[PDB]
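notes to self, project folder thing:

trying the whole complex as one job this time. last attempt i did each chain seperately and stitching them together was a nightmare. eight parts in total, labels are on each line so i dont mix them up again. if this works i'll redo the older ones the same way
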Amino acid sequence: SEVVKVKQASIPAPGSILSQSPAIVLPFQFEATTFGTAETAAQVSLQTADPITKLTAPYRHAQIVECKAILTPTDLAVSNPLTVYLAWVPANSPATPTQILRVYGGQSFVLGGAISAAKTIEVPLNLDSVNRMLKDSVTYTDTPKLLAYSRAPTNPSKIPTASIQISGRIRLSKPMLIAN
Amino acid sequence: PNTEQSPAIVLPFQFEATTFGTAETAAQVSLQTADPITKLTAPYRHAQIVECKAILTPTDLAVSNPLTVYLAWVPANSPATPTQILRVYGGQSFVLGGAISAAKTIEVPLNLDSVNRMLKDSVTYTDTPKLLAYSRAPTNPSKIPTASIQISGRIRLSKPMLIAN
Amino acid sequence: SEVVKVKQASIPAPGSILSQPNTEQSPAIVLPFQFEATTFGTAETAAQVSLQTADPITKLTAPYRHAQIVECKAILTPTDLAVSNPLTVYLAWVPANSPATPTQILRVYGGQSFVLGGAISAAKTIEVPLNLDSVNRMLKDSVTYTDTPKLLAYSRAPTNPSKIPTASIQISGRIRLSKPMLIAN
Amino acid sequence: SEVVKVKQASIPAPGSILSQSPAIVLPFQFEATTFGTAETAAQVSLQTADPITKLTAPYRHAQIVECKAILTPTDLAVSNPLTVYLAWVPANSPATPTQILRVYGGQSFVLGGAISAAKTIEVPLNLDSVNRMLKDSVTYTDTPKLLAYSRAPTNPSKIPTASIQISGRIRLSKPMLIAN
Amino acid sequence: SEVVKVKQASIPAPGSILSQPNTEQSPAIVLPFQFEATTFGTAETAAQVSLQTADPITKLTAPYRHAQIVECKAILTPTDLAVSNPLTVYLAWVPANSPATPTQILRVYGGQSFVLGGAISAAKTIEVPLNLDSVNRMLKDSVTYTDTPKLLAYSRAPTNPSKIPTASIQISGRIRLSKPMLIAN
Amino acid sequence: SEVVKVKQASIPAPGSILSQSPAIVLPFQFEATTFGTAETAAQVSLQTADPITKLTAPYRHAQIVECKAILTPTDLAVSNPLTVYLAWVPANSPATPTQILRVYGGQSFVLGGAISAAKTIEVPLNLDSVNRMLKDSVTYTDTPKLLAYSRAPTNPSKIPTASIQISGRIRLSKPMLIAN
Amino acid sequence: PNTEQSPAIVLPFQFEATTFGTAETAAQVSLQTADPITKLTAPYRHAQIVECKAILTPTDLAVSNPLTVYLAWVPANSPATPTQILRVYGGQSFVLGGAISAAKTIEVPLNLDSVNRMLKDSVTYTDTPKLLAYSRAPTNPSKIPTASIQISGRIRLSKPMLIAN
Amino acid sequence: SEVVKVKQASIPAPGSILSQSPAIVLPFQFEATTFGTAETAAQVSLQTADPITKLTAPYRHAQIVECKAILTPTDLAVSNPLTVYLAWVPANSPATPTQILRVYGGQSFVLGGAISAAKTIEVPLNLDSVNRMLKDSVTYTDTPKLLAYSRAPTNPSKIPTASIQISGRIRLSKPMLIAN
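result (full assembly):
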């Protein structure tokens, strides 16, 4: 029982931003991907992830205050373990989930099995690595993007074995004239 | 009361309140029920009106079938009926159909002193803003509105609401 | 054994409360309480328990007019059954006037997932305290409020359902009861 | 001849109110109930009593400044006495007039008969017991409510034997946009 | 009308009470109460009501372990019936671990006699407060005491018995409830 | 409702006492006599009244601290009034109840009737008139003695119309070696 | 505890506790039940023993039918039985019948440190004084006691009890 | 290997005691109950538990200095786990072992199984909750009482799977005159 933070080795390389009113900070937590049913290799791009933009929609400026990736195993993992790869990279990175371990910072976690415990692994996004702005007057390519991958499950089933959510907080600024 | 300085943002909004022509119309529009307004107040736990007015827009169809609408803002409490709008203080009566003039865009303001500007708090207030509008049975209905009423304004949101996503 | 206190990611957002006139105040008592919220293992159980409606709590709250929570925590308790018959539980303390079906707990900010049994040291009791600044402490007053605390929990239909629960959640805490109401006797 | 104040044993338990312009204070005095024709058990709730609201109607805020229950016997009572029960309780109280004496404060008065005098009994409402606000931006349940009861008269007639009025003063605030 | 408070001749004789360790004390509430003690007019009624056994009082006392009286008074209430059908009542606040049948109230030190109805201004309500230094204030504690308050009242079989009482006695007061007991829920 | 003290005109003439340990003061209240069944003329002598001595028995010294005569009418008196005479005199007094009004201090009270109220009359014993000691190493003749009388009731019945009790407090001293 | 200075008086007393000869006797005399003691503690609400002893008096009949009695004081709590008196600390064994000598009047004291001296308070104490006495079945019973046990002492009374008379 | 203290949520509510010599403090440790053979629901009342009184017997005063409940699993539990409930409540509590979890403080422990370790769980008795005196000049109802319960074992056997002992220290005062 409990959770554990496992930082991703990072190096300074923040995104450039606009020169530059009232702001509001909202929390969020959607699920990036699920494991267990088939070989899954996801590329979640915070900038365009639906759940995030549903909050973004009404604004012109939205920047990440904090953000972390939450890896969570389920009972199914105890009997049928699995291995997951994780990397927080800028959208520009030509790196594909199938090659996370070849990226500076890329981690590998083993979920399940009778040997281990069912801890919740948290891998925060180092904001000095990548662009904080998810929506601005210009679109940056530096945007934060989560890379995750796991080999096709030894015993596939429509009941997930592990899932990773992305929670955090966004600061919404300059209101956007939208329909409704 | 009002509100302090802790994290707060003001968003604009405008939705359609009611329409006329198709048949006799007597509406009782209540913000704090207005689906449009809520899709905005959904993420927060504290909403507060800052500005709000009702807009009366006739369509060209109006000239052929001139109507005549009544508008009036009143707290939800007010025992006033659409049928008694002109007997209320804010009560207005526009003609529409290109024989009724009333400045670029016909609009009747809220007031705020008249009502409670909450819409969403820890308690459900009773005296929130409500729009009363009546327009009698039209001769030669049409299925295609001859005029409508929009409600535009600005809401102040705070205290983020835990949500799904 | 062991007891593990796992706090829920939270955001300051207290519920507003009516004020008391500066007249002479009413005395006050503080009673403790702890009841069963739900049970897992028999069937897919996805419950929403609202402290407002909470029968056990209000049996204590009955005689008074003004009642506010002091402290509250959700207690997740696995049973020997869960050892060889694991399950995953979702928990979330929500404001009550909030959407969010227990099926969506992993999509709610605080949202947590725990594995009971199966994996090592999974027999521990989990504890998720209710941040009283997350919601509204008032459970009884001149007006009933909208942001009262509500606990969300979900699991999944077991693959080996049994008549005896494999885990449960209790809610314990302490209320501040005041302003006693005039009654028969 | 004359009148007498008979306080009702009360304990501190005021109503909660809203945080929070010009105000006006108006006096009022309507009659709550009448005795003599048949067993009467009234539950006057200041919040919704017609006479009171006729004054309330044009406003958004109305709070009780002072308020008392006035019990008054009539000549009919001299020949055919009666017993009346009185309790000032908050609207929430699950107490019914038939059980006033089982309520802390509940009084019993004997009106009439050759033995006594025909005094007017006054039982004021302790404002620290109950909610003062009769009309506000929210509706409170704490509202003041008068409980009164008397057994069916030994000799019924359409001429009342005793009646109880409720007089007081209300402070009207924030004007309500009404029709007319 | 009128209310007449007629105090009972009394002698200082407080009941000893157990002491509380100087550890941290329990919070405390103070609830009011008022129930019917007896009824006169139907038949010779000679009752002894002990606040200890008092059902209405202990329904309030139930959830707590330590309960003590703050104030208490006996209320004698005549009814219209008593106007043309007088009666005499006897009242006495006794320590409970005291002999004295209500038939002997006029032989007990404090002992009083009142005439309800018949004579002028006899429709008044009589009030006989309970001197809390006369008896023992404790009604619930680590031990049940012997000098707990007890009310004595007597009348006499009426000469014109009726199904509806001609007078009654209520007991109103306020208790100090503390040390809440651990229970189911 | 209520009680009234009616002092008896007295003149200084206390009893002589012995020159002269721990003492205890006990309260008492027995009933001296009853009225209504027949013409009653009682002569209660505090010194030998049974109830008093039941308390006296175990001691050698017992003196009156305070003492009063309590006259109490009953409903029966309302319909069938009566007149009672009262005098507190020393046991030596050659005065008989039939002649109380011819004694300085002797009072007359009218109990009952539709005219009056049913008050409880209290006539205290002036300790400076009479001997305080009820039991001492010598027996005094000065002892306090209550004289009461009432004419035979207009309508006799075995249900008393009025009764007079004697309450007070005694100080018991020097313990007496008694059997048991 | 003990007692302060507020109105208090000390009265003496002596009553018969038990008798022997008629048949086997095994008594368990409890003050605070002893009718004699109570006729004294009846008027008060607080009684307290100051002095107390048990007296053993044989009658001339004893010489003809010498017996042998056991005495012992113990708190009411003590699981001791009359039959086990000599196994108790205070335990005594007198012969009686003019062949047993033990000073003018055979008497066995209380102690007070051994028991609680209350008998009557706001609470009913459990460890109050109790007399244990046993004397086996006598050969040739007699309906006329051969010896008895008296209990004399002094009680401190306070807090007058409301009574009838 | 090792032991772990798991405090029971408690609230201030100590027992009342007598006003009030030499004292001695003795340690003790008996076993309250055993699990494994059948559904067991025990109600150990420190005041009357035999082992405790064997020490109490010779005295008039005995108060708890400290006291804890010791839960200990045995090898049998590894293969056939079980769940135990524990509550320290005053003897007055109308709570039965079958409903411990519905009592503020009531804990639940899972002993055995391949998943966990075989730790010894200790749950001390909060002396401010309950009466400290186990034997006094008056008998209190506030006495400490242990509530424990476990469902009927999946695989019953006469060899215990877990047992709970109660150790502590008592202060014995005023000697009691006993036989022997």
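what i see at first glance: The two ends of chain E are 48 Å apart (CA to CA).
need to look closer tmrw
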